Design a protein around this ligand. Sequence first.
Ligand SMILES: Cc1cc2nc3c(=O)[nH]c(=O)nc-3n(C[C@H](O)[C@H](O)[C@H](O)COP(=O)(O)OP(=O)(O)OC[C@H]3O[C@@H](n4cnc5c(N)ncnc54)[C@H](O)[C@@H]3O)c2cc1C
Length: 388
Amino acid sequence: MTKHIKILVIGVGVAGPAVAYWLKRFGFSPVLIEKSAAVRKGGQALDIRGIATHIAKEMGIYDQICNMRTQIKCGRYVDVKGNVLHEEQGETFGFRQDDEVEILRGDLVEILMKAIADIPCEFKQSVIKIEQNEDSVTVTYKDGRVENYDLVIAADGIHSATRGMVFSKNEYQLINLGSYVSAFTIPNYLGLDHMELLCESNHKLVTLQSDSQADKAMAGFMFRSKHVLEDIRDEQEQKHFLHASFQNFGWETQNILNRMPESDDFYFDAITQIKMKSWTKGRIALIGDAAYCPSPLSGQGNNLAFVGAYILAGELKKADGDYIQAFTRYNELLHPFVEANQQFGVWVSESFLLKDDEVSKEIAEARSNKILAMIKSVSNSINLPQYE
Ligand SMILES: Cc1cc2nc3c(=O)[nH]c(=O)nc-3n(C[C@H](O)[C@H](O)[C@H](O)COP(=O)(O)OP(=O)(O)OC[C@H]3O[C@@H](n4cnc5c(N)ncnc54)[C@H](O)[C@@H]3O)c2cc1C
């Protein structure tokens, strides 16, 4: 029966634990692995918007998410001299409305894992080799131990090792949006209280906020550049590039960058999307950022993780575990919605900033209203199957 189908789910992010939840509810027996020792606390703030709030409510986690939600009371668009151009209440500022909610990644993953407490999960574990034939997926773990599974679902993130192990370069594109993102935590030296400030120039944006930790602030940097690093994973090159890019910005960036050396969560990356004609090969499926990452400029990644998890599990349910049928349906039903959400990110990468002009109240307000409306349009733009 479907209960006896062996399914390996790789990574304890959003998509992995969510697809594990739905597979179990739908009569399958998934197991999870995670390379890290434990769920990473804190991290980036994730949005649940549009159709994804329905899925969260059905999973029984929506109230728990709302209990752990981000608490920004107001955001402000400020000029480099600290004048307020435009102020919005926190949810509106974040382009959320209605039942939509924002939660730090680590707090969401904790809730997801509490909802699957019955599902076996092994941390400090990773797959170093995958081979498949018509009957089985043979997995080799890091220590050489081998196990066979009927299916493997890889939720291992935008940099996914499984994608590289399974697919060739002809089978996916890494779409570079021409921009970089960086974030790090510093002492809250301004004494912000549940508030975010956002300052921009033609090609760059800087945010500073304090929310759940009164003595900490999170800094963020997004900027368009055609520069390529010698080694994009070299952290000292990243910090020199960030510093050089922002040396002339003004506002709080000297105060922020002067505290960068002592921050312990530093994050830097190119803004990239994953475009695949097929997320699946044989008995192996990619899901979440590994398959379809829309990039942070979209603000939809978490939504795509939730929707992908629901659809892949439900199509396996409706196929009674026939993965050839279900994987085809997974690809066909979800690609347009993924493409819409990725193209929203592309749009942000191209039109959010004012190329030739200085921001004003009128521009920030009209832009904010437009994004709110476009995101509501794109985030509701799938007719979600009903699998029960
Ligand atoms: C700067 C930034 C800002 C963002 N802002 C937003 C936003 O405003 N709204 C929004 O909705 N989304 C946002 N996101 C996106 C959100 O973080 C992702 O879309 C979401 O986390 C997708 O989850 P996932 O489960 O696909 O992957 P992830 O959450 O990345 O989890 C993948 C997991 O797999 C593990 N793993 C990796 N490799 C292996 C391996 N080889 N073996 C085993 N385990 C492995 C990882 O440690 C990790 O726990 C942002 C992301 C970033 C980086």
